[PDB]
Amino acid sequence: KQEELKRLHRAQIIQRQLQQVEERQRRLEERGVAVEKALRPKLMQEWFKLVQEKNAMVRYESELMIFARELELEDRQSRLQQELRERMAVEDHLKTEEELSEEKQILNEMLEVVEQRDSLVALLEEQRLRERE
Amino acid sequence: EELKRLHRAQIIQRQLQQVEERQRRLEERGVAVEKALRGEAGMGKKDDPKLMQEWFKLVQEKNAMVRYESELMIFARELELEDRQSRLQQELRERMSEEKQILNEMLEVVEQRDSLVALLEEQRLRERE
């Protein structure tokens, strides 16, 4: 329960930031429309700045996507781990051939959740080492 | 792959080295600017508002580097844990006794990684605000 609360809070923080990003992109969309309507000097210069600012927001949105997926995966993993801890309260000799292979299937699900998670951390690592430009 | 992971580790060790050096250069500019602020480098310098301005830019640039150093720390630990995890998983996916203990070591490694991701998230979502 204390594990699951620190997670809900991180999810809200992320939502709140995606909402702020959406809105900042909405303002840039409108300035962008006005600048392009004005293309019937300083005006061409504004168009390039808007492109930069939209780019920045997209990079920020991307990071939030990654964090939000990683968070979904922590949740799935935690639940699979619960399903597995429950099954391991019973000694192994007291289980069927079938019961034992469901334990092995749960464990595979959990390992491929972990693999996806590590793949998203590697991508985020790449992005943070690339943003030092 | 163990060599993907190796390569990512070398990248990180090398970026920490570039960071340590960028901080060394900033230490030196910082020392010169402060010698100039105490009127020791040129009798005009101390009156120039560009000089006070440099001091504040150095502080910002030092702060940026420390944020970067922090991120590299986290990534490097995470990477060690990814390595440990993948090896414990390999040990386990070979065996299928100490089988139940290996699984527990791996679940603790997974929990520590969750925890470093959460810390990284907190810091990245505080560099904005």
Numbering used by the authors:
A (entry chain A): 1841 to 1880, 1891 to 1983
B (entry chain B): 1843 to 1938, 1951 to 1983
Extract from the study:
Rab proteins, the biggest subfamily within the superfamily of small GTPases, are major regulators of vesicular trafficking in eukaryotic cells. One such family of effector proteins that was reported to link Rab proteins and the cytoskeleton is the Mical (molecules interacting with CasL) family.
In order to understand the mode of interaction of Rab proteins and the C-terminal Rab-binding domain of Micals/EHBPs, we first aimed at determining the structure of the RBD of one member of these families. Mical-3 folds into three α-helices, the central α-helix 2 and α-helices 1 and 3 folding back on the central helix. The asymmetric unit contains two copies of Mical-3 that form a central 4-stranded coiled-coil composed of α-helices 2 and 3 of each monomer flanked by α-helices 1 on both sides. The low affinity second binding site of Mical-3 (KD = 4.4 µM as determined by ITC) could also not be detected in these experiments, suggesting dynamic complex formation with a large koff.
